[PDB]
PDB file of C-alpha atoms in Angstrom:
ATOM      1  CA  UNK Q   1       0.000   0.000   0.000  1.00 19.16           C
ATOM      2  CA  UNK Q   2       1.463   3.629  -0.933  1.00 19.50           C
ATOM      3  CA  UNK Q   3       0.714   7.312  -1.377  1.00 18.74           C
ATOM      4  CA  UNK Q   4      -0.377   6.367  -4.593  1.00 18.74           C
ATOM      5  CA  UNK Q   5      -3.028   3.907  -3.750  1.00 18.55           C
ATOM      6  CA  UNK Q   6      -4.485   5.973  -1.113  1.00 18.82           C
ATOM      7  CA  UNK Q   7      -5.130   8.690  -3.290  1.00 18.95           C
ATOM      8  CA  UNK Q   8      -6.928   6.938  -6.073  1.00 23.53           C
ATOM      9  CA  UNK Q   9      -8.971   5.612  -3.156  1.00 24.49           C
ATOM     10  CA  UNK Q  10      -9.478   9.108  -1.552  1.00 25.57           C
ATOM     11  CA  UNK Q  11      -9.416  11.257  -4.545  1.00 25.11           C
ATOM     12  CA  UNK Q  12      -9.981   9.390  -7.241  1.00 22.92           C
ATOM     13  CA  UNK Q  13      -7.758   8.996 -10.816  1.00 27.47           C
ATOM     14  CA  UNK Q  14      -9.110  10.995 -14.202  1.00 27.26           C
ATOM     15  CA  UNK Q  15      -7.548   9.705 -17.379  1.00 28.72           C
ATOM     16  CA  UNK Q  16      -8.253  12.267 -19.668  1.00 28.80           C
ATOM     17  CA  UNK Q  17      -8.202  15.670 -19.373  1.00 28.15           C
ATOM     18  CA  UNK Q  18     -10.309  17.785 -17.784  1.00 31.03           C
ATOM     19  CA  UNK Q  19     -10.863  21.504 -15.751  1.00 32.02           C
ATOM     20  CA  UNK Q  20     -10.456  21.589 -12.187  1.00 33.61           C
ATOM     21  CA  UNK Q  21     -12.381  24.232 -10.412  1.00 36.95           C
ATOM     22  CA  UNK Q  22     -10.505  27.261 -10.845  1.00 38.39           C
ATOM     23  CA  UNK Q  23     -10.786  26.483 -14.459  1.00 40.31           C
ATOM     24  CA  UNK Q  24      -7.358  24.471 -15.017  1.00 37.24           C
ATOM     25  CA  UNK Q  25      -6.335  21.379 -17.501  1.00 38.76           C
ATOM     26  CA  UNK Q  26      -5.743  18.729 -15.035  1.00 40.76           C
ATOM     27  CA  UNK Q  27      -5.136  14.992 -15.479  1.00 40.79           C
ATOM     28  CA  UNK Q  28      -4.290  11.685 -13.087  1.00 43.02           C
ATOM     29  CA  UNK Q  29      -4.846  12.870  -9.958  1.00 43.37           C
ATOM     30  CA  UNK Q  30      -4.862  16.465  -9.302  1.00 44.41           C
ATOM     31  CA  UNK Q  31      -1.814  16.781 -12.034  1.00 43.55           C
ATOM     32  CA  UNK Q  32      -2.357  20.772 -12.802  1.00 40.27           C
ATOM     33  CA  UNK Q  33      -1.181  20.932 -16.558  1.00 42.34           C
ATOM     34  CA  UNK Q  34      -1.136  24.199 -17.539  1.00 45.14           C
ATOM     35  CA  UNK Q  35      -2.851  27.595 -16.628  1.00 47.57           C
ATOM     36  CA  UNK Q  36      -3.252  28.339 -19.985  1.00 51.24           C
ATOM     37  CA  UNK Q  37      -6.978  28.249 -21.478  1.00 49.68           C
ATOM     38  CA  UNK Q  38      -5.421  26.037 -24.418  1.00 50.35           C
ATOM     39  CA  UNK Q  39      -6.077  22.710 -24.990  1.00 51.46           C
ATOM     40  CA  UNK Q  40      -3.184  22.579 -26.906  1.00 50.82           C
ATOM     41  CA  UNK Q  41      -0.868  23.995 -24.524  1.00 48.83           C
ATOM     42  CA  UNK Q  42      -2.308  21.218 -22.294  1.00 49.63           C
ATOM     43  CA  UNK Q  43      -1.680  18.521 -24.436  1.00 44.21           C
ATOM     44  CA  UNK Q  44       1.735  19.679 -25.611  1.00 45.24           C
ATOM     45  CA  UNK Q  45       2.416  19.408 -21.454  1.00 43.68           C
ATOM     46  CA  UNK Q  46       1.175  16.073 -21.049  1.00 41.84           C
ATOM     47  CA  UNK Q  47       2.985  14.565 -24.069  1.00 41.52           C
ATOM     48  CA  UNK Q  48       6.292  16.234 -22.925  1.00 40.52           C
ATOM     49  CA  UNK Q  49       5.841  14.551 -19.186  1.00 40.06           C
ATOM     50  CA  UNK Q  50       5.174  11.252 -20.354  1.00 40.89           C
ATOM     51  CA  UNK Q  51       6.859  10.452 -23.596  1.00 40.33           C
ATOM     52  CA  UNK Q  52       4.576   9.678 -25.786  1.00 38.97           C
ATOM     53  CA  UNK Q  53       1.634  11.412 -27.829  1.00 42.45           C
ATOM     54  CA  UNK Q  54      -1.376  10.565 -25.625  1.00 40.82           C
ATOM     55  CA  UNK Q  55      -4.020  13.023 -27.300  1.00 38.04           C
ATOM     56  CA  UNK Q  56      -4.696  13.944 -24.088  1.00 37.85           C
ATOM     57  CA  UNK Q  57      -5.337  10.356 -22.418  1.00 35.15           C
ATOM     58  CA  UNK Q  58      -3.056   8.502 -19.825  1.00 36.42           C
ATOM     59  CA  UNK Q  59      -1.966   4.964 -18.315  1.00 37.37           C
ATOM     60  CA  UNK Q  60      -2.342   4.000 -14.665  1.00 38.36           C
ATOM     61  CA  UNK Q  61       1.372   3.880 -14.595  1.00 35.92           C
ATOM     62  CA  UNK Q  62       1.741   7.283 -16.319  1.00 38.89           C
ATOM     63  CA  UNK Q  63      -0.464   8.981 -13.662  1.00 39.45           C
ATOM     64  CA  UNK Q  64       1.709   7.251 -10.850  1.00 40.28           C
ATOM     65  CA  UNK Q  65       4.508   8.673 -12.241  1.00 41.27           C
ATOM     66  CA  UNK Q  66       2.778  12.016 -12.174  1.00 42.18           C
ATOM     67  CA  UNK Q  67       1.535  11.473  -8.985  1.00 43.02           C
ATOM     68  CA  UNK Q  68       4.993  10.641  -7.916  1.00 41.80           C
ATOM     69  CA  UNK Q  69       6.467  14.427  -8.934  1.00 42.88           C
ATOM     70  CA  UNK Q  70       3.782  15.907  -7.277  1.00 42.23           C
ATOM     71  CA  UNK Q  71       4.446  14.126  -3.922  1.00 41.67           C
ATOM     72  CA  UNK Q  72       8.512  15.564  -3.813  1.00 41.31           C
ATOM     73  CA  UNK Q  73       6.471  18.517  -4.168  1.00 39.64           C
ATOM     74  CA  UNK Q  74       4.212  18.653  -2.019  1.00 38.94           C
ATOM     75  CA  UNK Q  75       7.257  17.729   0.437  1.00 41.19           C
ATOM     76  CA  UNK Q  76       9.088  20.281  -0.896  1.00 41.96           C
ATOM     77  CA  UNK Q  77       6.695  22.925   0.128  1.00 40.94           C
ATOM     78  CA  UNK Q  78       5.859  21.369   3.737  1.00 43.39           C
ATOM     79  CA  UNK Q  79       9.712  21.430   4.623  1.00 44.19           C
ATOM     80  CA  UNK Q  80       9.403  25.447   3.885  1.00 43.71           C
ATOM     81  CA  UNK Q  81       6.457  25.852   5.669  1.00 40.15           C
ATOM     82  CA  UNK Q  82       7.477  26.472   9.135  1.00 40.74           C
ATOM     83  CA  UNK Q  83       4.605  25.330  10.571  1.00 39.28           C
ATOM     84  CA  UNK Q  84       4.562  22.158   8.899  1.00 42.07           C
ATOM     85  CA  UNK Q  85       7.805  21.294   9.006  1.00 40.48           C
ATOM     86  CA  UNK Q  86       8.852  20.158  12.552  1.00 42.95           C
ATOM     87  CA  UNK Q  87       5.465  17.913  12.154  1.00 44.23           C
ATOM     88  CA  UNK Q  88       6.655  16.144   9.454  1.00 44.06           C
ATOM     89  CA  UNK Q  89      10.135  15.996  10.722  1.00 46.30           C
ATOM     90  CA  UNK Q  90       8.548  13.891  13.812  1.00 46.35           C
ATOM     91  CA  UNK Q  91       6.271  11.413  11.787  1.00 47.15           C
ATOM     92  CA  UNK Q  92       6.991   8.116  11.020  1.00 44.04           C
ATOM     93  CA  UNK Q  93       6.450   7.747   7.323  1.00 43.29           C
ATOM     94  CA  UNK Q  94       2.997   5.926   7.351  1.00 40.48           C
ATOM     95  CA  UNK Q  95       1.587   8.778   9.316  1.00 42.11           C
ATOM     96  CA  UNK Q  96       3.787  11.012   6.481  1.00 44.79           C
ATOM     97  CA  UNK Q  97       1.741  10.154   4.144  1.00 44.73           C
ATOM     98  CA  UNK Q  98      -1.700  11.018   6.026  1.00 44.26           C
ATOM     99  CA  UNK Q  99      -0.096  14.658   6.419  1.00 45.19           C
ATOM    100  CA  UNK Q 100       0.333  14.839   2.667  1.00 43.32           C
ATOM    101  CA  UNK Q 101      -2.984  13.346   1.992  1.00 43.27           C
ATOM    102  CA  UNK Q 102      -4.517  16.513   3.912  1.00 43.21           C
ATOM    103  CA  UNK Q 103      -2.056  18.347   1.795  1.00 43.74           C
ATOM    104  CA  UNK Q 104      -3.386  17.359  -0.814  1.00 44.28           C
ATOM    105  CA  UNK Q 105      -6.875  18.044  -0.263  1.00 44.99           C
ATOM    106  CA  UNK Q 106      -6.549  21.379   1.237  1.00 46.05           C
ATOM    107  CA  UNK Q 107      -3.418  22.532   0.520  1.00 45.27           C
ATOM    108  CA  UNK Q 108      -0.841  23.974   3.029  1.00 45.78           C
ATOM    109  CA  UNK Q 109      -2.679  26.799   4.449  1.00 43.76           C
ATOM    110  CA  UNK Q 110      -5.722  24.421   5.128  1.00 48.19           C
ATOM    111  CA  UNK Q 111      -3.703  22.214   7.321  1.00 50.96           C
ATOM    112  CA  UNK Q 112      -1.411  24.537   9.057  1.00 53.24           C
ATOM    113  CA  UNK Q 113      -4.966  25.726  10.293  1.00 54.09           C
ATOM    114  CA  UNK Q 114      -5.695  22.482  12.401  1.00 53.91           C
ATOM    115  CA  UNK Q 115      -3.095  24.026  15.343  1.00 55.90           C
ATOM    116  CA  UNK Q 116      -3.975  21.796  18.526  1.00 55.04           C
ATOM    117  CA  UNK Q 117      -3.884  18.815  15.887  1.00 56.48           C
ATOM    118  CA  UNK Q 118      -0.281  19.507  14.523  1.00 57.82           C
ATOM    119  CA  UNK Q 119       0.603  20.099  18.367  1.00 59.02           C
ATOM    120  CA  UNK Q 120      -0.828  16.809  19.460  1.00 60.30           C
ATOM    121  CA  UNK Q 121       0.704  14.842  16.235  1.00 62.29           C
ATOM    122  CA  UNK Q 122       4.310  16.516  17.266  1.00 61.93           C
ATOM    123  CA  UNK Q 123       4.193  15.007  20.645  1.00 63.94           C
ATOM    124  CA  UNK Q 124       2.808  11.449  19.412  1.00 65.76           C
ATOM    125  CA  UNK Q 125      -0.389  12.221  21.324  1.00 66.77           C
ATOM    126  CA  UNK Q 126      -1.908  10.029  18.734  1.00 66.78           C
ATOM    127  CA  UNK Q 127      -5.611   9.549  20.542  1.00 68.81           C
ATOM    128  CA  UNK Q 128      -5.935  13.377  21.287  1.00 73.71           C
ATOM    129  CA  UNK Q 129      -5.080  14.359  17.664  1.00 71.68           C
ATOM    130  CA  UNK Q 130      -7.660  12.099  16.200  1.00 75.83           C
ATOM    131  CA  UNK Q 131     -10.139  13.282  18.644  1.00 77.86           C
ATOM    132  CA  UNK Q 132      -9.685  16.850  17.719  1.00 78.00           C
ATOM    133  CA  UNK Q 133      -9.099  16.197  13.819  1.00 81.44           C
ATOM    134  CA  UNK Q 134     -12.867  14.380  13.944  1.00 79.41           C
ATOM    135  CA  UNK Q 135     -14.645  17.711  14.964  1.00 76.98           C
ATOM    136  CA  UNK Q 136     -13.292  20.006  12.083  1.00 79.31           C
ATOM    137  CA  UNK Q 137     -15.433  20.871   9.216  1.00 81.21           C
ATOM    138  CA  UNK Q 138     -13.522  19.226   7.147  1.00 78.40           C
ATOM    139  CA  UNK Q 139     -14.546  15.818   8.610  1.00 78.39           C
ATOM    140  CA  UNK Q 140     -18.053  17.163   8.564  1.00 80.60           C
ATOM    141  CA  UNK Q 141     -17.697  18.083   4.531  1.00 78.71           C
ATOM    142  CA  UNK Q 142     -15.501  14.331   3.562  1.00 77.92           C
ATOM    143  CA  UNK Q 143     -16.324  12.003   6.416  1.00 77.75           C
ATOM    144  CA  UNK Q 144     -15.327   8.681   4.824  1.00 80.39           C
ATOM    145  CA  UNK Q 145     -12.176  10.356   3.238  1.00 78.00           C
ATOM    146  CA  UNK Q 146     -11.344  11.759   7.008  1.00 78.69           C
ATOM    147  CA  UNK Q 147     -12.273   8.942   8.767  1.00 79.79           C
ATOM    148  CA  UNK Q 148      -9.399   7.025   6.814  1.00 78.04           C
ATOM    149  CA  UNK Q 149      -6.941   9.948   7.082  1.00 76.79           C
ATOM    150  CA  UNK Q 150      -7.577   9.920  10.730  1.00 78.79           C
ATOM    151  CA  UNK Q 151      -7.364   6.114  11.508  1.00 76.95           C
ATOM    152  CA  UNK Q 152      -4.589   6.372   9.795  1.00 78.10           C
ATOM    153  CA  UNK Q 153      -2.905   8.663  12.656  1.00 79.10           C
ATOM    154  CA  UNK Q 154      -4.516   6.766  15.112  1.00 76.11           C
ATOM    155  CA  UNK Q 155      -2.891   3.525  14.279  1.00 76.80           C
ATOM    156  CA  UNK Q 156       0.109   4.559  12.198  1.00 80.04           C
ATOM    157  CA  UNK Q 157      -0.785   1.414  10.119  1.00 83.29           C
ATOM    158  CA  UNK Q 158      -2.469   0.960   6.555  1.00 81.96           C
ATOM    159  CA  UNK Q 159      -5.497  -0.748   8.032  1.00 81.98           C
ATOM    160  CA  UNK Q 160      -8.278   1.492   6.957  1.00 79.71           C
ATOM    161  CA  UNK Q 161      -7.224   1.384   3.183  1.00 79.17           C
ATOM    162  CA  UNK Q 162      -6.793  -2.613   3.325  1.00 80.11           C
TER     163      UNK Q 162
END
């Protein structure tokens, strides 16, 4: 079980191309393509990532391998984010991935909003951090995606996704 995998679950995997909300090409899962309102643009994009003319359609494999760039950068940004940083520093790398999950979802700002959570998660105060995590909105607005997210911190294990 991987980042990967729990995504599709959570999020879901789009093989063609399509807008997101603000209006953006996207592809795989939550790939951003190109700002540009060009479909063209976006397809030139795609083609150059994977290495081979797709007319705007992808593999499994070729959306993993998306998927994969976009983890290092969601990493990338966390380990800048002062707030999120000495979290992550302290996780174990199952409970990692949770943390990017909710990256994922709602960005950096979103999490580094859940304050008594990050606290909690920083001093392995597993119970206390799902407690608090299950009375955000954001359970209230995805409660089967949270539920796993927050098992997942709970337990430090891949159970929930089995």
């Amino acid at each position: 079980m991987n980042i990967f995998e729990m995504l599709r679950i959570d999020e879901g995997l789009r093989l063609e191309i399509y807008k997101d909300t603000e209006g953006y090409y996207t592809i795989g899962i939550g790939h951003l393509l190109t700002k540009s309102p060009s479909l063209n643009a976006a397809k030139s994009e795609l083609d150059k990532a994977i290495g081979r003319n797709c007319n705007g359609v992808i593999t499994k494999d070729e959306a993993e391998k998306l998927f994969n760039q976009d983890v290092d950068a969601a990493v990338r940004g966390i380990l800048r984010n002062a707030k999120l940083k000495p979290v992550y520093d302290s996780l174990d790398a199952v409970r990692r991935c949770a943390l990017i999950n909710m990256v994922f979802q709602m960005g950096e700002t979103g999490v580094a909003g859940f304050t008594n959570s990050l606290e909690m998660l920083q001093q392995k105060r597993w119970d206390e951090a799902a407690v608090n995590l299950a009375e955000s909105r954001w359970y209230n607005q995805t409660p089967n995606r949270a539920e796993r997210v927050i098992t997942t911190f709970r337990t430090g294990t891949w159970d929930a996704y089995k």
